[PDB]
Amino acid sequence: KPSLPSSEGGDPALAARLQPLYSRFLTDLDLQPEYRRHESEKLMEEVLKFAKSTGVPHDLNSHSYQSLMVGYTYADNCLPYHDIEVKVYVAIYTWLATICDDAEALGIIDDVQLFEQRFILGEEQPTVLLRAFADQLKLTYKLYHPLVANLILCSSLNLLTSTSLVARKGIKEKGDHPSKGGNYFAWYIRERDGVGEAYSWFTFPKRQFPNLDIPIEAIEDMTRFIAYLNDVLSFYKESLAGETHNYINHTAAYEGVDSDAALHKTAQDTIDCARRIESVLAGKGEYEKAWRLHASGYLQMHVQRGRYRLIEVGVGDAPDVHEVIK
Amino acid sequence: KPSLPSSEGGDPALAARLQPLYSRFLTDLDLQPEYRRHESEKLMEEVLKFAKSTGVPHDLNSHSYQSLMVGYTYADNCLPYHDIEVKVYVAIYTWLATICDDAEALGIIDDVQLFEQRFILGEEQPTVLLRAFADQLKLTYKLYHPLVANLILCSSLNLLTSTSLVARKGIKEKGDHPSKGGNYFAWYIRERDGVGEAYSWFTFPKRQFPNLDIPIEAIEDMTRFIAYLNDVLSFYKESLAGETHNYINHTAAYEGVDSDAALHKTAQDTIDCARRIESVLAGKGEYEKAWRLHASGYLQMHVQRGRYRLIEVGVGDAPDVHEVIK
Ligand SMILES: CC[N+](CC)(CC)Cc1ccccc1
Numbered sequence: 001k002p003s004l005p006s007s008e009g010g011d012p013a014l015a016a017r018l019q020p021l022y023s024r025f026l027t028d029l030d031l032q033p034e035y036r037r038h039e040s041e042k043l044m045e046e047v048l049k050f051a052k053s054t055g056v057p058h059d060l061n062s063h064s065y066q067s068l069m070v071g072y073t074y075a076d077n078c079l080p081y082h083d084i085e086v087k088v089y090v091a092i093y094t095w096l097a098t099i100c101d102d103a104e105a106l107g108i109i110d111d112v113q114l115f116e117q118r119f120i121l122g123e124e125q126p127t128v129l130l131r132a133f134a135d136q137l138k139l140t141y142k143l144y145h146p147l148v149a150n151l152i153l154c155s156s157l158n159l160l161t162s163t164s165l166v167a168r169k170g171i172k173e174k175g176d177h178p179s180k181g182g183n184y185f186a187w188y189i190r191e192r193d194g195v196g197e198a199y200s201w202f203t204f205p206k207r208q209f210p211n212l213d214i215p216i217e218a219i220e221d222m223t224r225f226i227a228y229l230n231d232v233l234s235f236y237k238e239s240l241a242g243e244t245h246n247y248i249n250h251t252a253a254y255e256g257v258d259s260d261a262a263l264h265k266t267a268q269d270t271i272d273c274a275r276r277i278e279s280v281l282a283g284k285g286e287y288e289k290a291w292r293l294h295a296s297g298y299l300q301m302h303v304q305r306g307r308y309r310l311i312e313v314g315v316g317d318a319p320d321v322h323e324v325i326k
Numbered sequence: 327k328p329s330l331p332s333s334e335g336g337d338p339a340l341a342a343r344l345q346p347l348y349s350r351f352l353t354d355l356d357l358q359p360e361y362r363r364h365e366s367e368k369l370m371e372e373v374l375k376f377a378k379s380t381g382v383p384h385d386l387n388s389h390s391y392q393s394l395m396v397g398y399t400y401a402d403n404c405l406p407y408h409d410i411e412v413k414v415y416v417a418i419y420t421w422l423a424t425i426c427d428d429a430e431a432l433g434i435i436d437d438v439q440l441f442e443q444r445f446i447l448g449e450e451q452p453t454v455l456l457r458a459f460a461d462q463l464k465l466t467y468k469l470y471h472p473l474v475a476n477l478i479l480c481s482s483l484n485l486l487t488s489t490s491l492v493a494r495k496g497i498k499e500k501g502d503h504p505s506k507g508g509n510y511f512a513w514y515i516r517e518r519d520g521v522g523e524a525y526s527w528f529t530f531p532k533r534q535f536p537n538l539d540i541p542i543e544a545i546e547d548m549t550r551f552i553a554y555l556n557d558v559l560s561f562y563k564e565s566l567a568g569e570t571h572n573y574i575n576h577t578a579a580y581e582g583v584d585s586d587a588a589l590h591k592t593a594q595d596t597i598d599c600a601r602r603i604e605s606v607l608a609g610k611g612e613y614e615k616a617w618r619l620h621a622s623g624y625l626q627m628h629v630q631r632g633r634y635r636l637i638e639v640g641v642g643d644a645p646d647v648h649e650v651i652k
Pocket residue numbers: 094097098101159193194195196199226227230
């Protein structure tokens with residue numbers, strides 16, 4: 001199982017190997033315009049109030065608070081001009097979902113695996129975390145068109161399932177012993193664990209973005225952009241924690257190349273997705289502009305937040321005093 | 327909207343265009359071994375008993391009974407040596423899901439669009455069809471490992487959502503006016519409407535196939551195999567009904583080629599998927615043999631069933647007296 005999150009130590013040799021790729025990737029993504037923030041202090045007030053309402057602990061310097069700061073920053077950087085109820089919704093979703101994402105390290109896979117059957121039977125979840133996530137999934141329907149909320153929910157449920165699959169020894173065995181012809185397995189797991197489809201659709205809540213038809217052709221590329229950008233830049237922190245049965249390493253295994261080759265390919269794949277999204281969204285009004293600010297903000301979130309430890313690689317920013325893991 | 331299903335007339339020019347492609351495809355698929363059936367009369371007794379219990383009408387010579395015969399034959403041909411409770415489960419799921427698949431022609435999009443939020447809130451569904459589908463989705467957990475059942479459910483929910491999306495004018499508009507860089511949209515819709523992931527996993531119920539790790543690398547190729555084989559061989563019946571905003575025509579639109587080019591490519595994509603699955607499953611015991619019988623049976627289901635009208639193209643079998651639409 002992976003180690004728990006930490007702010008201590010690191011891997012200087014891996015950081016030296018990754019810094020050149022990471023610095024070139026940040027430039028070559030060429031995400032414009034510059035990221036924006038809006039009503040940042042009002043957002044923090046409203047996020048902390050909602051967080052209190054869930055009952056889920058988020059003490060300063062905890063893993064939970066680290067994840068709350070990821071969710072705050074996701075909304076602040078990626079959805080700056082969105083309705084504040086939507087920004088809080090995404091911040092809180094991202095807090096809870098990133099804790100679930102760490103379920104193997106936290107020892108909560110058993111209840112994560114049982115979440116979906118309890119959810120569709122109306123059985124209350126066993127923990128404060130999972131009751132808050134279930135309530136957050138139901139809240140999606142207040143803010144997103146029902147078809148879009150439907151897709152957000154199936155993507156969110158697939159997170160829990162794929163996180164549980166990678167916790168299985170027989171699934172970790174695939175990376176060590178890849179089957180000939182099995183190359184699609186890397187994206188099979190990554191499409192489901194990465195929640196790229198949910199995060200793509202979060203850009204387009206129904207009141208401000210009432211026409212789901214306008215950006216839909218781009219969703220797949222937005223999903224892959226989101227998943228692949230994180231696969232490149234979270235490789236460092238995943239290596240530190242031993243959570244290395246990931247898309248990069250699975251890709252390297254099926255393609256018979258090393259992690260560095262899969263990182264370079266995945267970096268180029270991210271750029272190719274970003275350029276296709278900008279072609280599809282050319283002349284699509286507020287949809288085009290909202291996506292552009294989401295992509296630019298999403299790169300900066302990784303630069304900024306302690307979850308990704310990028311200050312250690314020389315491309316990120318030092319953590320805030322309360323976000324450092326104690 | 328598409329016309330209702332019929333057994334009358336056809337399109338002799340389209341049939342003459344497709345027959346050579348279809349006869350070559352049936353050979354080139356080279357699906358071995360020969361398809362098998364087992365306890366066919368006992369399965370029909372059990373399927374009709376369960377169908378009665380749902381309350382969903384299935385009168386002889388109705389669209390519903392045509393779909394019940396697809397579900398029967400799906401189980402009979404593709405899961406011959408599976409537990410009869412699993413064969414009945416798949417037949418009844420297929421009956422109800424293929425009626426849902428026709429929701430636009432039937433005028434029930436409003437109900438299918440609202441199914442998932444009702445389902446996750448524990449609200450009753452508004453029609454006997456959808457109450458039976460909701461009950462069938464919950465039954466999945468008695469027969470499949472919870473992670474596998476989880477994936478079947480998300481794939482099932484995505485069917486309803488993607489069927490609803492294609493009913494929208496702004497989604498039909500994409501095929502007429504494809505956006506540059508939008509090529510992934512064809513598979514975005516087809517991954518979600520095709521239920522290929524559910525039908526892949528139906529092969530591996532938990533009592534007979536207790537290790538989900540064994541075939542998992544193949545699921546994506548089994549998903550595409552299922553979707554693409556149908557996209558080729560159902561193009562005739564979809565053309566007759568005017569349900570032509572499909573994977574073949576979306577692919578032709580984004581690639582800038584005609585339907586015949588997209589059909590030829592999709593046929594080769596099917597064969598490529600079938601070969602990769604047989605590589606990944608080489609030496610995987612009862613998993614490998616169960617998949618082989620499912621693929622061979624799945625081609626024969628399209629040959630035999632009135633839903634696909636392939637007797638009109640010269641590659642299918644004449645319908646049974648009770649399955650002809652009146
Ligand atoms: C690729 C996933 N993500 C969000 C888009 C990267 C920042 C983190 C995340 C993982 C799992 C659950 C929720 C968020």
